[PDB]
Design an enzyme around this catalytic site. Structure first.
Site, PDB file in Angstrom:
ATOM      1  N   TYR A   1      37.787   1.250   6.151  1.00  0.00           N
ATOM      2  CA  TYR A   1      38.653   1.681   6.991  1.00  0.00           C
ATOM      3  C   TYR A   1      40.082   1.266   7.090  1.00  0.00           C
ATOM      4  O   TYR A   1      41.175   1.585   7.671  1.00  0.00           O
ATOM      5  CB  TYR A   1      38.673   0.670   8.003  1.00  0.00           C
TER       6      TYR A   1
ATOM      7  N   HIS B   1      23.264   5.645  17.173  1.00  0.00           N
ATOM      8  CA  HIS B   1      24.228   5.546  15.676  1.00  0.00           C
ATOM      9  C   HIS B   1      23.823   5.695  14.489  1.00  0.00           C
ATOM     10  O   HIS B   1      24.332   6.204  13.382  1.00  0.00           O
ATOM     11  CB  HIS B   1      25.324   4.602  15.633  1.00  0.00           C
TER      12      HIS B   1
ATOM     13  N   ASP C   1      27.882   8.773   8.376  1.00  0.00           N
ATOM     14  CA  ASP C   1      28.815   7.575   9.111  1.00  0.00           C
ATOM     15  C   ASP C   1      29.631   7.673   8.195  1.00  0.00           C
ATOM     16  O   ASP C   1      29.942   8.705   7.581  1.00  0.00           O
ATOM     17  CB  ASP C   1      28.021   6.295   9.418  1.00  0.00           C
TER      18      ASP C   1
ATOM     19  N   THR D   1     -14.119   6.709  -6.027  1.00  0.00           N
ATOM     20  CA  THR D   1     -13.650   8.368  -7.136  1.00  0.00           C
ATOM     21  C   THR D   1     -14.403   8.357  -8.389  1.00  0.00           C
ATOM     22  O   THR D   1     -13.840   8.125  -9.001  1.00  0.00           O
ATOM     23  CB  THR D   1     -12.558   8.512  -6.627  1.00  0.00           C
ATOM     24  N   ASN D   2     -15.365   9.110  -8.032  1.00  0.00           N
ATOM     25  CA  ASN D   2     -15.411   9.788  -9.351  1.00  0.00           C
ATOM     26  C   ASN D   2     -15.057  11.099  -9.504  1.00  0.00           C
ATOM     27  O   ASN D   2     -14.417  12.620  -9.090  1.00  0.00           O
ATOM     28  CB  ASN D   2     -16.946  10.477  -8.491  1.00  0.00           C
TER      29      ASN D   2
ATOM     30  N   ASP E   1     -14.333   7.246  -0.212  1.00  0.00           N
ATOM     31  CA  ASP E   1     -13.998   8.032  -1.081  1.00  0.00           C
ATOM     32  C   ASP E   1     -13.169   8.864  -1.549  1.00  0.00           C
ATOM     33  O   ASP E   1     -11.961   8.853  -0.390  1.00  0.00           O
ATOM     34  CB  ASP E   1     -15.472   8.894  -0.503  1.00  0.00           C
TER      35      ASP E   1
ATOM     36  N   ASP F   1     -13.371  12.913  -2.238  1.00  0.00           N
ATOM     37  CA  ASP F   1     -13.283  14.101  -2.487  1.00  0.00           C
ATOM     38  C   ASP F   1     -14.538  14.335  -1.093  1.00  0.00           C
ATOM     39  O   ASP F   1     -15.301  13.550  -0.969  1.00  0.00           O
ATOM     40  CB  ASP F   1     -14.017  15.029  -3.189  1.00  0.00           C
TER      41      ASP F   1
END
Ligand SMILES: CCC(=O)N1CCC(NC(=O)Nc2ccc(OC(F)(F)F)cc2)CC1
Ligand SMILES: CCC(=O)N1CCC(NC(=O)Nc2ccc(OC(F)(F)F)cc2)CC1
Ligand SMILES: [Mg+2]
Ligand SMILES: [Mg+2]
Lengths: 547, 547
Positions: A466, A524, A335, A123-124, A9, A11
């Site tokens: 690098y 890290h 990093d 759900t209604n 349900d 609500d």
């Protein structure tokens, strides 16, 4: 007995407090005859305004006045006035936003799905067209992504407790009454479930409900540990592609709305390294754009070393905004990504709403001493030297990609990679195992994801990052007169033994209004090591400084 | 003599009023010694704060106080006080936003580029880090997309009138002094150009400037007609891809930031049909997402007829938002796209911030009379019948794709396609030419773009949209109790002889707060027929109703 499906349900089950329980307080608040509102709401039963609304026959805005009418005549046959400023609209607006997700229930749903239950909401509910409809829409998005199915009364044209809708539920779940659990705050909506032979739970207080569910499913649901943030499934994500240069195209994944937030991963990673942050920041009110940085994944990966010096990297990201029509974005990086992020604030601040780094400090280049020198200075950077010679670092990294990531991605208390004397040892993995154990940080599946990506273009591109030490340094020296005076957060990680927190200790000198953040017991690989605290720290800062 | 390159100053050429001319008014405003401000600004000449700023040595926020200092001592050696609330920051904030794009100059730039001039901006400017920096950033985006190059002093580390920067200009333009024109509001910045042998123009009032430029280039620049809106180059756009179903993936192009606006094209088109609206709406403060609708382009194109009934089409778009994390978006559609857009407002209004259609009216299904009947009712819909039989309409449409679009895409006063007695004639093109003339509405190139797209998946998918009449009608009848009470604009096109404006004449009954818009002398292909007035009408409505 035994079950394999769980139905919730909305609500008063997945969302609290229920709208019917604001209905009620209103009466007390304004001294109304007990149940006046509710009389007018249920009025006409199956042939009245409210039911028509739940079946999608009419809209909420359409229903509002019919309700106010019924309230009139409910309060006529009761012989009572109606307050000066009576608005069914105001009462229902308050109620509807007052209602939040009931967290423990949602977690319970998650758990059961995680153990292979089919999850659904029944759900209604109504076609919402009020001017403030977007709030409930947000709620409903957040929920539905965690369920197999969102069966809504007004979408299907059937209503709880009408059997048709349950036949339709079973139908949609491709399962049988006895394989299903259904929880609701309304007894009437349970009786039908029962008659087909369904396990049912009258959801009163949430904790007892979970107790029944726990029992009858045989999975711990209450009291179980802090669950991870929501993680992305890559095939369910919006994938974006922007060419920025004749033969360079950057890819990213995008989710959410609001101020653009650009995530930038480190070496050797992927937009996927932000899987825990993407949903959370989106949910916090942002538009996350998580990059494949140049050299990685579906982003292009040209061979030339120079194509990965910070300058060309940065101009490219500027272009990236340009071509997406974004005048700014808040940049968060980790990093290597961190460094870039800082250098974006330094060179293109008009384009940076705010800057943020995880682990990566801002260190100004030393104009006198070179950078190859500065790096040999500290032993824990030896791996950097080993990466210099084109082709050597790649051969090792590419030889068994699984082994590689399995070896890299480890929590602080797990390590298998020392980072010193790597040149001398003659390998990153010279003395780590062929089949490493799986870190606590990553499912086998998550590792394979990275392995797929890195089959695209190997490590040449990534390793080039690098390989521009001398260039980046020369460029960096142009910025030695500047300070960062835009919002900047720095986020140090206790147990990162290479991007150590002390390395940031003077950052305030060049970033005077800098805000900090820090993570105990975190290595890290920040994002996957401590995804919760990362989300908390970043969302907080975003809300304070990116508005 | 003769030229092939045009270079523009920013402040006082491409952007007016110039910052130096607010500098000045300030003095008069506050009864300051004439040139006090300017003295303090130019102070130290090549070795002072301002030059360091223009070279990127320091930031604007960094410069602010050095300036205020100089103003102190400029006003010390002058022997004068300084006003209670003196702020170089406030003066420069005002000035900097006060400054807008100088439209006629930009148009002039555009023209010359259109005739194959290399265009560039050469601008003394700064790294802007003020908290209100985003405004200038927006300006600078808008401009730079229309130029080959944006050479900025602080990015290059050189400054006007220093020769180095001109050598660098020529260098970047791969052209020679005598092939280049350079316009500036400052004589000093012209003398250098001259010494290399450049054509130069002292830009005072804009119109005389253009007169000189006009002469010396030999292209009409002043007084030339209303130029079209900016159009997209597809390879410079962000392309997005979202799978919504196991084997259906929707593609779209995305540009801009702010409230999501989802554009939805008609039969037989493409996100490209919104090329004129994408930049404009982005520029107006929105986030345009222009679709390839299911069946078209890089969006998937499954064969099954049912895969193109409005319902599955609509659920899919809901999913589309879901997966992009958008709780709502304003939906604008044309031709078939329009219809869908309405049916989104009718079924999922919580997800629609606002709705808008070009040409396509909202007509409710007639529950009694069928739709095949309703369509034979009006002769101008005969083409619809001809499209029913799988495979026939495709064979014709696919046989010569160029011919096809060249035949379809025509302005009202150009036609070659009658739409009645098509079944009887036995073809859409039964009596139109093999090599049609090029409409005024589309370059040969733009046609070829569509031809490429349609080679991907042909017309099967697109034609299926017409093939779910009975289904859509059945679905539509569920919504017969509802009204549209969310913001909706309807935009009728005088000379569209199939989606005729009268067909909308009762729309107010089901859409009571409906706002309208209308285009004289405008055919079916609204977007490319009248792109300017479309942009004006839509932007206007968006700003009034989508906030
Ligand atoms: C000032 C330091 C700085 O800004 N830097 C940018 C980022 C930093 N990043 C890394 O070295 N990351 C890293 C280092 C080692 C590593 O594992 C392995 F690859 F095995 F070496 C994985 C990632 C390199 C230096
Ligand atoms: C109520 C009418 C309506 O909503 N409709 C949805 C949109 C409408 N669109 C079209 O028929 N468009 C169109 C019609 C003809 C056409 O040229 C050609 F294909 F040659 F027939 C190109 C486009 C078909 C009917
Ligand atoms: Mg309930
Ligand atoms: Mg100027």
């Amino acid at each position: 007995m035994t079950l394999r499906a769980a139905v919730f349900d909305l609500d008063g089950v997945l969302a609290l407090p229920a709208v019917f329980g604001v209905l009620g307080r209103t009466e007390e608040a304004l001294a109304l005859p007990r149940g006046l509102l509710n009389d007018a709401f249920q009025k006409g039963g199956p042939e009245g305004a409210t039911t028509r609304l739940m079946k999608g026959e009419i809209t909420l805005s359409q229903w509002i006045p019919l309700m106010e009418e019924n309230c009139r005549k409910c309060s006529e046959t009761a012989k009572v006035c109606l307050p000066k400023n009576f608005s069914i609209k105001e009462i229902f607006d308050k109620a509807i936003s007052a209602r939040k997700i009931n967290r423990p229930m949602l977690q319970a749903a998650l758990m059961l799905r995680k153990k292979g239950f089919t999850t659904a909401i029944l759900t209604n509910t109504w076609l919402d067209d009020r001017a403030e409809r977007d709030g409930l829409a947000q709620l409903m998005c957040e929920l539905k992504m965690h369920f197999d199915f969102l069966i809504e009364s007004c979408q299907v044209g059937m209503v709880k407790p009408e059997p048709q809708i349950y036949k339709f539920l079973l139908d949609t779940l491709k399962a049988s009454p006895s394989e299903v659990v259904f929880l609701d705050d309304i007894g009437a909506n349970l009786k039908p479930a029962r008659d087909l032979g369904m396990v049912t739970i009258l959801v009163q207080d949430t904790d007892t409900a979970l107790k029944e569910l726990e029992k009858v499913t045989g999975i711990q649901l209450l009291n179980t540990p802090a669950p991870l943030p929501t993680s992305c499934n890559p095939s369910d994500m919006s994938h974006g592609y922007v060419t920025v240069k004749p033969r360079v195209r950057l890819h990213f994944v995008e989710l959410g709305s609001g101020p653009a937030v650009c995530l930038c991963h480190g070496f050797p990673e992927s937009w996927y390294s932000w899987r825990y942050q993407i949903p959370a920041l989106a949910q916090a009110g942002y538009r996350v754009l998580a990059m494949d940085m140049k050299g990685y994944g579906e982003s292009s990966a040209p061979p030339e070393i120079e194509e990965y010096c910070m300058e060309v990297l940065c101009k490219e990201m500027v272009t990236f905004l340009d071509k997406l029509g974004l005048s700014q974005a808040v940049f968060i990086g980790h990093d290597w990504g961190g460094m870039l992020v800082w250098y974006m604030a330094l060179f293109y601040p008009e384009r940076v709403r705010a800057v943020a780094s995880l682990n990566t400090p801002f260190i100004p280049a030393n104009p006198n001493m070179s950078p190859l020198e500065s790096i040999k200075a500290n032993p824990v950077f030896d791996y950097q030297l080993y990466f210099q010679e084109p082709g050597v670092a790649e051969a090792e990294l590419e030889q068994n990609l699984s082994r590689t990531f399995k070896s890299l991605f480890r929590a602080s208390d797990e390590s298998v990679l020392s980072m010193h004397k790597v040149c001398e040892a003659g390998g990153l993995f010279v003395n780590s195992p062929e089949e490493p154990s799986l870190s606590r940080m990553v499912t086998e599946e998550e590792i394979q994801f990275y392995v797929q990506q890195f089959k695209k273009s190997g490590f040449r591109g990534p390793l080039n990052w690098y390989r521009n030490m001398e260039r980046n340094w020369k460029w960096a020296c142009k910025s030695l007169g500047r300070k960062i005076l835009i919002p900047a957060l720095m986020v140090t990680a206790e147990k990162d033994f290479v991007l150590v927190p002390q390395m940031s200790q003077h950052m305030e000198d060049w970033i005077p209004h800098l805000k900090r953040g820090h993570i105990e017991d975190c290595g890290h690989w920040t994002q996957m090591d401590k995804p919760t605290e990362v989300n908390q720290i970043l969302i907080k800062w975003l809300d304070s400084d990116a508005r």
